[PDB]
């Protein structure tokens, strides 16, 4: 774990075991850990994409780390998906663990599928970012974003470093997940990975431009004209 140092507003990285006499550390308050979002690199943030970057393994314990500051997220997720047999696919969050508090669009996902045993670990080993903490696994019903953690040494300086989209999973990861976008409990639109969080809201706004929720069992799934 290298420590970056910001010097003259320039990021340089110091060797861990070097006698770097240019680095002056008068207080532990100069040492910070920062959680960064996987948005910075342009990676897609839609639901199928997120599902495809997650997976499971049993026999490996979860690990948790703390952080001081982080990036604002445009997108985050809240997963509470049940197993096909009715049990949960995910563990309970530990006491003191709360979801990520700084997100514009959350993709809340439920529904069902044939979830394997083990923990829901990130495919590239990225951490799930939670409220001032991060961990290697996904917890049930807890909001999180995906990210990485950098460690910095700061000079003395003063830098200081919403809506819900509801989706329903179907067979969760077995080749494909037949996700539906929920408009109401009866009205669904089959999800297609072209629709951004903004398009989904705009589509929802249009649907209720001349409408409202009513009552019972229509259970109709709509497709978008591909044009």
């Amino acid at each position, epitope marked *: 774990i290298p420590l970056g140092v910001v010097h003259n507003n320039t990021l340089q990285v110091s060797d861990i075991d070097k006698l770097v006499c240019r680095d002056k550390l008068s207080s532990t308050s100069q040492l910070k850990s920062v959680g960064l979002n996987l948005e910075g690199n342009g990676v897609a943030t839609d639901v199928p994409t997120a599902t495809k970057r997650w997976g499971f393994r049993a026999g490996v314990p979860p690990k948790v780390v703390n952080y001081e500051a982080g990036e604002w997220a445009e997108n985050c997720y809240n997963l509470d998906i049940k197993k096909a047999d009715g049990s949960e696919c995910l563990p309970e969050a530990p006491e003191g663990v709360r979801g990520f508090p700084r997100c514009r669009y959350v993709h809340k996902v439920s529904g069902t599928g044939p979830c394997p045993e083990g923990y829901a670990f990130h495919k590239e080993g990225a951490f799930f970012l939670y409220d001032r903490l991060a961990s290697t696994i996904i917890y049930r019903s807890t909001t999180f974003s995906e990210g990485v953690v950098a460690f910095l040494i700061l000079p003395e300086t003063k830098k200081d470093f919403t809506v819900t989209l509801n989706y329903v999973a179907d067979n969760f990861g077995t080749n494909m997940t037949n996700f539906l976008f929920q*408009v*109401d409990h*009866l*009205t*669904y*639109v089959q999800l297609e990975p072209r629709f951004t969080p903004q398009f989904l809201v705009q*589509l929802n706004e*249009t*649907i209720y*431009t*001349n*409408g409202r929720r*009513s*009552n*019972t*069992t*229509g*259970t*109709l*799934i*709509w*497709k*978008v*004209n591909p*044009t």
Partner: antibody
Framework: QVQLVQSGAEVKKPGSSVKVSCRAS?????????ISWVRQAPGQGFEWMGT????????TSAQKFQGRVTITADKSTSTAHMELNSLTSEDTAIYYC???????????????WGQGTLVTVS | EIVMTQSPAIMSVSPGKRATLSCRAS??????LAWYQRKPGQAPRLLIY???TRATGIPARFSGSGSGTEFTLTISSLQSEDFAVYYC?????????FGQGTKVEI
């Protein structure tokens, strides 16, 4: 409601496609009503095929026509269109257009309905 | 998904008599039904919707009521101009359904 206007009847060789259309009046209908279609095969009532919500450009259809009938419309003229591909003898029917209050996924009906037109083969 | 039947297939109504159409759903939907008048060769016209509410331009002679799965539609003093096939449409769920209609003969 609108004046529902339908295209002329025709006979194709089996396996051919028919483009069925209804250039009904009503611009406001793009947000107030779905464009709906049925297939009234001889001896049958008004079997549901599908419906369009032009303000969203959203569509839905019966499983019976998946891979067989394209459901669309020209939003600027409010003209309903269908592509009855690989048309067969079992598709002999009077095809009709109508205006059903926006559906979402709740209970709905039309007050008006067109005269429809015959589409058949051989 | 919803299910509706046809009953009677044909009803005999001398003009001036009250005609009856019997709509029997498999679902408790008497509040989500619609009835249409279809003259031979003509488009069906909505007469009544929901339960008993009349459609625009429909004579008072057209009336009906129901509860749960069943609704009875009647036409008081049915006239020559009303010898139409009357259809029971159920619009409660998707796919929507219908009876095949009741023909009326003198």
């Amino acid at each position: 409601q609108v004046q529902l206007v339908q295209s002329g009847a025709e006979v194709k060789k089996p396996g051919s496609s028919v483009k069925v259309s209804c250039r009904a009046s009503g611009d406001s209908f793009s947000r107030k009503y779905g464009i709906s279609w049925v297939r009234q095969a001889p001896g049958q009532g008004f079997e549901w095929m599908g419906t369009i919500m032009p303000i969203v450009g959203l569509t839905t259809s019966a499983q019976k026509f998946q891979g067989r009938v394209t459901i669309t419309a020209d939003k600027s003229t409010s003209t309903a269109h269908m592509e009855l591909n690989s048309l067969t003898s079992e598709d002999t029917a009077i095809y009709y257009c109508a205006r059903d209050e926006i559906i979402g996924a709740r209970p709905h009906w039309f007050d008006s309905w067109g005269q429809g037109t015959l589409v058949t083969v051989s | 998904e919803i299910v509706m039947t046809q009953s009677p297939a044909i009803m005999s109504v001398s003009p001036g008599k009250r005609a009856t159409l019997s709509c029997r759903a498999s679902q408790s939907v008497s509040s989500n039904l619609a009835w249409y008048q279809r003259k031979p060769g003509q488009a069906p016209r909505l007469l009544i919707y929901g339960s008993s509410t009349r459609a625009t331009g429909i004579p008072a002679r057209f009336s009906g009521s129901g509860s749960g799965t069943e609704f009875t539609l009647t036409i008081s003093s049915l006239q020559s101009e009303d010898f139409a096939v009357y259809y029971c449409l159920q619009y409660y769920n998707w796919p929507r359904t219908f009876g095949q209609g009741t023909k009326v003969e003198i």
